[PDB]
């Protein structure tokens, strides 16, 4: 059934599973027309499909051409997401296919179930966890590849860089969601924390800076403070 804090430890077992987040698939800017009506302009989006044990991120870039001449785009976006996840599973060798797919939003359940009817043994599950994957487009290198795309494209990343050499995936996921949640709460501040120090750089083949173990503890504390800070600014506490 649904994942939540009474059984989140199943994410780090050896059954292959993927999270699917669709919150950045259909993206728009809203603006005024010459006549003073309102219109939308779509911009490129992405499906965020992540293996939480390995860090492998299947970023399917959604080019605005896919919306041309279509109606009810917010509804189409869920079915297009399900179509692309289904196509991804079919492209993987059988021993790499997930045994479970966890959708971050319950409106993806039926679209994905219908597209995966050919895979009755793959469990499609919702989650009570409020995961911050909408903030993926705050990672500069991911945002860059989405906005530069001129056609549909899949790009593979490891969202944990090399962290698993030193920490467990339970810890790597803890750090990842804490970073994404901080980017979601106050993007400017979070990015200043991550990049204020010019001596720590991001390797060409990485997404995040090359922090020592001790530096990560400092960064993690600063992100905890930021999330607490914004909570007080928001609620006047």
């Amino acid at each position: 059934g649904a994942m939540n804090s009474s059984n989140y430890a199943e994410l780090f077992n050896n059954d292959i599973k993927l999270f699917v987040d669709d919150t950045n698939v259909y993206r728009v800017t809203v603006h005024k027309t010459f006549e003073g009506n309102v219109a939308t302009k779509a911009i490129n989006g992405c499906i965020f499909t992540l293996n939480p044990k390995t860090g492998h991120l299947f970023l399917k870039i959604i080019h605005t051409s896919v919306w041309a001449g279509q109606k009810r785009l917010s509804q189409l976006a869920k079915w297009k997401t399900a179509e692309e996840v289904s196509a991804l599973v079919r492209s993987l060798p059988k021993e790499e296919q997930p045994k479970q797919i966890i959708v971050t939003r319950k409106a993806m359940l039926d679209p994905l179930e219908v597209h995966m009817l050919d895979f009755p043994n793959i469990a499609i599950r919702p989650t009570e966890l409020r995961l911050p994957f909408s903030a993926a487009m705050s990672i500069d290198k991911l945002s860059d590849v989405v906005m530069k795309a001129t056609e549909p494209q899949m790009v593979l990343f490891n969202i944990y860089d090399d962290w698993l050499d030193r920490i467990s995936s339970y810890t790597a996921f803890s750090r990842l969601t804490l970073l994404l949640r901080a980017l979601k709460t106050n993007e400017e501040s979070a990015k200043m924390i991550l990049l204020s120090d010019p001596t720590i750089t991001i390797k060409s083949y990485h997404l995040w800076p090359s922090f020592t173990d001790e530096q990560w503890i400092t960064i993690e504390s600063q992100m905890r403070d930021l999330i607490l800070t914004e909570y007080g600014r928001k609620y006047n506490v």
Partner: protein
């Protein structure tokens, strides 16, 4: 007119014949039901006074044989049987009518209710849903499960309704996943009508039979089937105009007949609100929407 005689009535029981019912006392001088309209299927049904558990009954068509009821003290129920000796049977019925030991099927002449509830119901199709080929009549009770319920246990005692499943490979064409899930016209028209039922008359017959089993026996799997067959039509954008008009009439008479006090358990709030107020056919069921809004406005 036809007659279903009773050998006797040894246990107190409420007896139904179609939409009518009456109480018989233990060992009362009751010897059956006369004046049954020829031309329609019928259902004769039972609820024991001492154990309302298990409503049960028999679907039959008087044109297919001479049928009677006899209590079986070993299996503890009223059983339908066929008498093949035509002369023995005529003799028995005449003696019981002469002595006036029978209730008369009480059809009002203005009244088309039973026809309207059974218009498309055929005994040959009932017998394929209820498999017991050595008898010309078909036994149904409150507890019998459907073939679909058995997939989610005795196969001999099951209701073999046509399986409808909106998230199934049969319902969804590869490459039209969104289209076929949000508009079920493919599943209704090609898969079900052309493919399985062959025509809308057979589809309506199964729909009507499912409702009647839900109403008369409280059969839960039958109520699920009735609602599935309604939902498949209402969730299709493309339905023949004559089917919509007939569906509206069918449902109208079904809602009209339903006991007011059983509406809570026989009607699925989600399906009806979807069908009358959200679906493609939300504006196509005028008679049904009017009787539902005036009779069961709570559900909506």
């Amino acid at each position: 007119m036809n007659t279903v005689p009773f050998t006797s009535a040894p246990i107190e029981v409420t007896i139904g014949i179609d939409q009518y019912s009456f109480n018989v006392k233990e060992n009362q001088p009751f010897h059956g039901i006369k004046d049954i309209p020829i031309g329609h299927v019928h259902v004769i049904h039972f609820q024991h006074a001492d154990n309302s558990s298990m409503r049960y009954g028999y679907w039959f068509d008087c044109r297919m044989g001479n049928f009677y009821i006899q209590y079986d003290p070993k299996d503890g129920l009223y059983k339908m049987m066929e008498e093949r000796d035509g002369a023995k049977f005529e003799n028995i019925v005449h003696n019981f009518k002469e002595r006036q030991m029978m209730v008369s099927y009480p059809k009002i002449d203005e009244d088309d209710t039973w026809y309207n509830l059974t218009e498309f119901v055929q005994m040959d199709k009932i017998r394929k849903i209820v498999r017991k080929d050595e008898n010309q009549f078909s036994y149904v009770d409150s507890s019998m499960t459907t073939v679909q319920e058995n997939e989610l246990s005795d196969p001999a005692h099951s209701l073999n309704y046509t399986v409808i499943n909106f998230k199934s490979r049969e319902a969804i064409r590869p490459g039209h996943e969104m289209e076929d899930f949000l508009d079920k016209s493919y599943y209704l028209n090609t898969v079900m009508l052309q493919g399985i039922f062959k025509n809308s008359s057979n589809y309506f017959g199964e729909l009507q039979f499912a409702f009647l089993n839900a109403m008369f026996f409280g059969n839960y799997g039958s109520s699920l089937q009735w609602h599935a067959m309604i939902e498949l039509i209402c969730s299709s954008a493309t339905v023949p105009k004559h089917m919509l008009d007939k569906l509206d009439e069918i449902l109208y008479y079904q809602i009209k007949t339903l006991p007011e006090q059983y509406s809570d358990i026989l009607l699925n709030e989600r399906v009806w609100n979807i069908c009358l107020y959200s679906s493609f056919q939300k504006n196509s069921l005028h008679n049904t929407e009017k009787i539902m809004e005036n009779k069961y406005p709570e559900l909506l």
